[PDB]
Each structure stands twice: as structure tokens, then as C-alpha cells.
UniProtKB/Swiss-Prot annotation:
Name assigned to this protein: Fibronectin
Expressed in which tissues: Expressed in the inner limiting membrane and around blood vessels in the retina (at protein level). Plasma FN (soluble dimeric form) is secreted by hepatocytes. Cellular FN (dimeric or cross-linked multimeric forms), made by fibroblasts, epithelial and other cell types, is deposited as fibrils in the extracellular matrix. Ugl-Y1, Ugl-Y2 and Ugl-Y3 are found in urine.
Post-translational modification summary for this protein: Sulfated. Forms covalent cross-links mediated by a transglutaminase, such as F13A or TGM2, between a glutamine and the epsilon-amino group of a lysine residue, forming homopolymers and heteropolymers (e.g. fibrinogen-fibronectin, collagen-fibronectin heteropolymers).
Encoding gene per record: FN1
Organism: Homo sapiens (Human)
Summary of subunit composition and partner proteins: Mostly heterodimers or multimers of alternatively spliced variants, connected by 2 disulfide bonds near the carboxyl ends; to a lesser extent homodimers. Interacts with FBLN1, AMBP, TNR, LGALS3BP and COL13A1. Interacts with FBLN7. Interacts with COMP. Interacts (via type III repeats 9-14) with TNFAIP6 (via CUB domain); this interaction enhances fibronectin fibril assembly. TNFAIP6 may act as a bridging molecule between FN1 and THBS1. Interacts with TNR; the interaction inhibits cell adhesion and neurite outgrowth. Interacts with FST3 and MYOC. Interacts with SVEP1. (Microbial infection) Interacts with S.aureus FnbA.
Function per UniProt: Fibronectins bind cell surfaces and various compounds including collagen, fibrin, heparin, DNA, and actin. Fibronectins are involved in cell adhesion, cell motility, opsonization, wound healing, and maintenance of cell shape. Involved in osteoblast compaction through the fibronectin fibrillogenesis cell-mediated matrix assembly process, essential for osteoblast mineralization. Participates in the regulation of type I collagen deposition by osteoblasts. Acts as a ligand for the LILRB4 receptor, inhibiting FCGR1A/CD64-mediated monocyte activation. Secreted by contracting muscle, induces liver autophagy, a degradative pathway for nutrient mobilization and damage removal, and systemic insulin sensitization via hepatic ITGA5:ITGB1 integrin receptor signaling.
Motif (Cell attachment site): 78-80
Domain Fibronectin type-III: 4-94
Illness association: Glomerulopathy with fibronectin deposits 2: Genetically heterogeneous autosomal dominant disorder characterized clinically by proteinuria, microscopic hematuria, and hypertension that leads to end-stage renal failure in the second to fifth decade of life. Spondylometaphyseal dysplasia, corner fracture type: An autosomal dominant form of spondylometaphyseal dysplasia, a group of short stature disorders distinguished by abnormalities in the vertebrae and the metaphyses of the tubular bones. SMDCF is characterized by flake-like, triangular, or curvilinear ossification centers at the edges of irregular metaphyses that simulate fractures. These corner fractures involve the distal tibia, the ulnar aspect of the distal radius, the proximal humerus, and the proximal femur.
Localization per record: Secreted, Extracellular space, Extracellular matrix; Secreted
Amino acid sequence: VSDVPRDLEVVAATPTSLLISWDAPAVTVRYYRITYGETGGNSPVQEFTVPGSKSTATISGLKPGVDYTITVYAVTGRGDSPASSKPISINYRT
């Protein structure tokens, strides 16, 4: 049943750049929404949607040596029904 959020890990980092990768089942997923922000509360960093076509992603513009909270909102649907998914979030030091 539940199996949209999984395999979320970091492959490596680079000068002002990080590479995160998760999963994408075969169910025609409507779209994905990746949002991230450095712990602070001064202002959210950024977010971006994708047709679930990209299984990986390259994010940059962050600050090395700091806590970072990530949240992936996976929305699926068969046509237009209230098909609500199960979003998830986790904190990690990057």
C-alpha cells in the first residue's frame, strides 16, 4: 500500500552544492514538491515542483556546516479525485 516516500539519502556534497536522491514508483504520480529551508525562521529558502520525472536533484545556494530541514510532498491522483498522499519531513545536518 504505502510506498511513495523511500530511499531518501545523500550521495555526496560539493562546493556550494548538494545532491539528494529518493524514489519514484510506477504509479503515474501527478507531481512532486521539494521544499527546503535552513533552521532559523528568518525566511524560507526555496521550493520547486517537478513532474516526478527526476528521481534525483541538485540543490545549491545553501550554507555548508548547518542544520537543514527537508520535506517532500508527493501528490498522486487517478484523474481528479481527492487522492491525498502522505507527505513526510526529516531534519538532517548537512
